[PDB]
Write a protein that binds this ligand. Structure first.
Ligand SMILES: *[C@@H]1O[C@H](CO)[C@@H](O[C@@H]2O[C@H](CO)[C@@H](O)[C@H](O)[C@H]2NC(C)=O)[C@H](O)[C@H]1NC(C)=O
Ligand SMILES: OC[C@H]1O[C@@H](OC[C@H]2O[C@@H](O)[C@H](O)[C@@H](O)[C@H]2O)[C@H](O)[C@@H](O)[C@H]1O
Ligand SMILES: *[C@@H]1O[C@H](CO)[C@@H](O)[C@H](O)[C@H]1NC(C)=O
Length: 705
């Protein structure tokens, strides 16, 4: 009764070939209350398919122990897409990349004996197989594959493994063949895909990802041409600018794919949303995952992009009957101009008129009619006669963002975190430096590295006014050097160069001195060959120079360790644990002091406009609302980059249209309205660096013209 197949031309759904317009919405990057609205906006946006990864590390935070509640109710999500009458592309992975913590892998999986990620490895294959089968059976049980009458029209195994293969060699090739075969073996009833996988074995369709995919061809003539990730922008990193991609360029890129036998394209992202909590964003990925998506982080329409693409879709639909019953024939129109014509025997005809010149308009003559093609544009003629649309002629009104403060400054109470000093009587120690992930298992961003340094009272520097020199090399990502109780410096890295060295004169005194290093990870790496093996934390070298002896290798002494903060162990973020301790009030409020907790109670504003926290007054830390993790803040990290003004025309790259340079990387932090009660809301902020909580203001988001 229902089926999904495919031929050289398209995916065939229930016996009908389709030109499928898709967009990505990641279920855990918004709330269940937001989903129907997001999905409805997608539908009105002209999307046929919603595409999502599955996030293993969210769904299995402990072997055998699963989570499918709240924003992680995968089944609830898929069912809401079905209710909107849209299809689903379930990209199961379970390596997913996605700028997501560890690429989606549960951290515990690293520490399974014999384990090795994304290669021909028995522990890996068992774990991977097990979870993929769990997800497929969960879907099948509720008849959620299209074959069974459900919305899922295809699924992805792995993610962009192709590049990784080339470096890993034969074991990669064997893993690829295994992953494809095992996926197909789960008998979903619908096609399987792998992205960036030139060697995908039948019957798996290999797809394309990027800014443009118009030249791409699947690895067999009898597979449709599909573009699984049309990048709508780029991620925002802490330390980085807000990257935009011009709607006119996207529409061009899409038109250019479709005109050339493309039959499936998917905006990555259609709704980017938010990296909530502390196990969502990957290495240095900002809380905001806006991606300059057609639906902004807050779920509002990103005009004009949203509309311009709605118009594109409308035009593709007018062309569809012709598109699906012919093949693209190319007629040269000029030096740098083409016609792509889909003429069926039924008489139905659709034409695409292109101008690849990035500088000049060209007048072109097609079937006796003149067409002005703006630079870097395509005109779509659904009947081969009248241009209903052109990729550079944007007929939606633009929109910009306003954040209107609402409520005011709340009453704050503080709670100072202690700066721990090692001693003779510690619990968890070793004669060397341990890698952070290994020690913390990612239970917290924080690991204290602690040691004693003995200074003999005859030391040269003691006789004079001098201070010895301390070098702390760390694999990243932030490091606070504490000497004899006091903060001595803070060094921090970038996505590209997460490595750190602190280098400074430290005032030591005769006898036993206390060094305490606060090592902080900001998400776990999520992309790269052997990215799981990359280190975090202070693995040194660590030297103390300017002594009677030459330098002293402090990696070679006894170290002690404290995982996490005490506020974490006390859950000062939840309502129960917060009022199980006692906080400072009034005048004696923690002002610009590191490692501080702050707490306040507020009423939800009225209105139906999305809400954020203005955290400009703050440094770096985490935010909770009624015990639910809003995410990490890091307004302290100023955006660095090249932010020239750009035009839509010409080959786009992620750095072309960057904005907000010399401003806080992310100032506003999304708060889902579904997280609020009318009154008595608990706002907890751990401040890592130092900030003034008073000026923390709640804000209301609208989009003007
Ligand atoms: C769109 O698809 C068809 C095939 O699916 C392409 O036409 C084929 O071109 C190949 C290689 O150049 C020929 O050997 C085949 O004989 C053609 N097949 C058929 C069935 O006609 C066509 O070129 C593609 N369109 C564009 C724009 O390239
Ligand atoms: O899949 C979602 C994310 O993909 C990321 O890039 C993946 C791709 O990166 C290429 O540079 C590389 O050649 C290839 O091996 C893949 O790893 C995107 O950069 C990211 O924005 C998401 O789209
Ligand atoms: C990892 O942790 C264990 C102690 O729990 C230790 O034996 C091992 O050497 C550590 N290795 C590192 C930090 O790489």
């Amino acid at each position: 009764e229902f089926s999904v197949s495919y031929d050289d031309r398209a995916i065939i759904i229930n016996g009908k070939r389709k030109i499928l317009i898709s967009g990505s919405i990641h279920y855990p990057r918004s709330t269940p209350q937001m989903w129907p609205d997001l999905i409805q906006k997608a539908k009105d946006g002209g999307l046929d398919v919603i595409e999502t990864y599955v996030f293993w590390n969210g769904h299995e935070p402990s072997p055998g122990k699963y989570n499918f509640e709240g924003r992680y109710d995968l089944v609830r999500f898929i069912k809401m897409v079905q209710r909107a009458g849209l299809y689903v592309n379930l990209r199961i992975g379970p390596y997913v990349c996605a700028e997501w913590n560890f690429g989606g892998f549960p951290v515990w999986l690293k520490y399974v004996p014999g384990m090795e990620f994304r290669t021909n490895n028995q522990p890996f294959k068992v774990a991977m197989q097990g979870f993929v089968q769990k997800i497929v059976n969960m879907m099948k049980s509720e008849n959620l594959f299209e074959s069974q009458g459900g919305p899922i029209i295809m699924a992805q195994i792995e993610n962009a493994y192709g590049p990784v293969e080339w470096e890993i060699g034969a074991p990669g090739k064997a893993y690829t063949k295994w992953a494809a075969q095992m996926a197909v073996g789960l008998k979903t009833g619908v096609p399987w895909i792998m992205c960036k996988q030139e060697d995908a074995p039948d019957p798996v369709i290999d797809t394309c990802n990027g800014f443009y995919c118009e030249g791409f061809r699947p690895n067999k003539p009898y597979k449709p041409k599909m573009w699984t990730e049309v990048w709508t922008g780029w991620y925002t990193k802490f330390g980085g600018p807000i990257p935009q991609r011009p709607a006119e360029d996207i529409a061009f890129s899409v038109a250019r794919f479709v005109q050339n036998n493309g039959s499936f394209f998917n905006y990555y992202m259609y709704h980017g949303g938010t990296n909530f909590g502390r196990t969502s964003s990957g290495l240095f990925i900002a809380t905001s995952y806006d991606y300059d998506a057609p639906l902004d982080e807050y779920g509002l329409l990103n005009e004009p992009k949203y509309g311009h693409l709605r118009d594109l879709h409308k035009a593709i639909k007018l062309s569809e009957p012709a598109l699906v019953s012919s093949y693209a024939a190319v007629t040269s129109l000029g030096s740098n101009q083409e016609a792509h014509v889909y003429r069926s025997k039924s008489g139905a005809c659709a034409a695409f008129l292109s101008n690849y010149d990035s500088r000049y308009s060209v007048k072109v003559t097609f079937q006796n009619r003149p067409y002005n093609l703006p630079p870097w544009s395509i005109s779509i003629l659904p009947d081969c006669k009248t241009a209903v649309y052109n990729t550079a002629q944007v007929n939606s009104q633009s929109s910009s963002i306003k954040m209107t403060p609402a409520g005011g400054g709340l009453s704050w109470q503080s709670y100072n975190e202690e700066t721990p000093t090692a001693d003779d009587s510690d619990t968890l120690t070793a004669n060397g430096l341990w890698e952070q992930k290994n020690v913390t298992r990612d239970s917290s961003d924080y690991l204290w590295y602690m040691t004693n340094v003995n200074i003999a009272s005859n030391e040269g520097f003691l006789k004079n006014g001098k201070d010895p020199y301390l070098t702390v090399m760390s694999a990243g990502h932030v490091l606070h050097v504490f000497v004899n109780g006091k903060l001595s410096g803070t060094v921090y890295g970038t996505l590209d160069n997460p490595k750190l060295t602190y280098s400074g004169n430290v005032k030591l005194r005769a006898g036993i001195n206390k060094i305490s290093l606060l090592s902080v990870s900001v998400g776990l790496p999520n992309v790269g060959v052997h990215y799981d093996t990359w280190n975090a934390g202070v693995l040194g070298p660590v030297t103390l120079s300017g002594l009677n002896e030459g330098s002293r290798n402090l990696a070679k002494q006894k170290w002690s360790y404290k995982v996490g903060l005490k506020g974490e162990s006390l859950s000062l973020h939840s309502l129960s644990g917060s009022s199980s301790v006692e906080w400072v009030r009034g005048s004696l409020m923690a002002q610009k002091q590191p490692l501080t907790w702050y707490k306040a109670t507020f009423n939800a504003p009225g209105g139906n406009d999305p809400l954020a926290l203005d955290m400009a007054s703050m440094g770096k830390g985490q935010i909770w609302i009624n015990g639910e993790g809003v995410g990490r803040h890091w307004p302290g990290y100023i955006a660095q980059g090249d932010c020239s003004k750009c035009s839509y025309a010409g080959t786009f790259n992620e750095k072309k249209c960057q904005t907000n340079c010399g401003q806080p990387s992310q100032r506003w932090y999304h708060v889902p309205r579904s997280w609020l009660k009318p009154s008595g809301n608990l706002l907890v902020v751990f401040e890592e660096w130092g900030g003034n909580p008073t000026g923390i203001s709640l804000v209301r988001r609208s989009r003007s013209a």
